[PDB]
Design an enzyme around this catalytic site. Sequence first.
Site, PDB file in Angstrom:
ATOM      1  N   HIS A  79       0.741  -1.230   0.000  1.00 52.89           N
ATOM      2  CA  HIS A  79       0.000   0.000   0.000  1.00 52.89           C
ATOM      3  C   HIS A  79       0.783   1.299   0.000  1.00 52.89           C
ATOM      4  CE1 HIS A  79      -3.613  -2.292   0.350  1.00 52.89           C
ATOM      5  NE2 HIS A  79      -3.155  -2.908   1.454  1.00 52.89           N
ATOM      6  N   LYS A  86      -4.926  -9.804  -7.531  1.00 51.63           N
ATOM      7  CA  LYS A  86      -5.676  -9.211  -6.412  1.00 51.63           C
ATOM      8  C   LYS A  86      -6.693  -8.234  -6.974  1.00 51.63           C
ATOM      9  CE  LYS A  86      -5.135  -6.774  -2.041  1.00 51.63           C
ATOM     10  NZ  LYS A  86      -4.240  -5.989  -1.178  1.00 51.63           N
ATOM     11  N   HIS A 137      -3.212  -3.002   7.808  1.00 51.56           N
ATOM     12  CA  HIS A 137      -4.258  -3.276   6.830  1.00 51.56           C
ATOM     13  C   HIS A 137      -4.776  -1.937   6.326  1.00 51.56           C
ATOM     14  CE1 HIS A 137      -8.300  -4.476   5.468  1.00 51.56           C
ATOM     15  NE2 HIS A 137      -8.755  -3.577   6.364  1.00 51.56           N
ATOM     16  N   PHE A 138      -5.024  -1.876   5.014  1.00 50.64           N
ATOM     17  CA  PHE A 138      -5.682  -0.713   4.405  1.00 50.64           C
ATOM     18  C   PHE A 138      -7.173  -1.000   4.312  1.00 50.64           C
ATOM     19  CE2 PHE A 138      -5.274   3.262   2.229  1.00 50.64           C
ATOM     20  CZ  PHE A 138      -6.508   3.370   1.601  1.00 50.64           C
ATOM     21  N   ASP A 139      -7.987  -0.201   5.000  1.00 56.26           N
ATOM     22  CA  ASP A 139      -9.422  -0.477   5.045  1.00 56.26           C
ATOM     23  C   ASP A 139     -10.213   0.263   3.982  1.00 56.26           C
ATOM     24  OD1 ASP A 139     -11.099  -2.289   6.628  1.00 56.26           O
ATOM     25  OD2 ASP A 139     -12.267  -0.473   7.163  1.00 56.26           O
TER      26      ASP A 139
END
EC number: 4.6.1.18
Length: 124
Positions: free
Chosen positions: A12, A41, A119-121
Amino acid sequence: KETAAAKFERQHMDSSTSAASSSNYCNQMMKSRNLTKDRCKPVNTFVHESLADVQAVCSQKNVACKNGQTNCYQSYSTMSITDCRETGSSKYPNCAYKTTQANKHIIVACEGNPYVPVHFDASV
């Protein structure tokens, strides 16, 4: 094995560029960061900011993640991001993406000591 913090950076972060420079940004970056190696992905966001500015989001506005976890945080500021999502023609191993430039707040999940993104939400 790769730490969750390190996987966040690989998936990210793009401190090397200010924004996506062409329609091929996602195609190139998704491949280079190994996000297409095993499967395409389907969606992924890259953040064009310094690492420290993104890690600092872990001490910004707490908010529940999409999945309900309570360790998400929204950035106070907008950030330069690139949204990548598969085109209709994407088909492994020839994974293909639409590149969309935006300036949005980010929401990340944080863990650890130091307390950093894992984590990228969402972009919001």
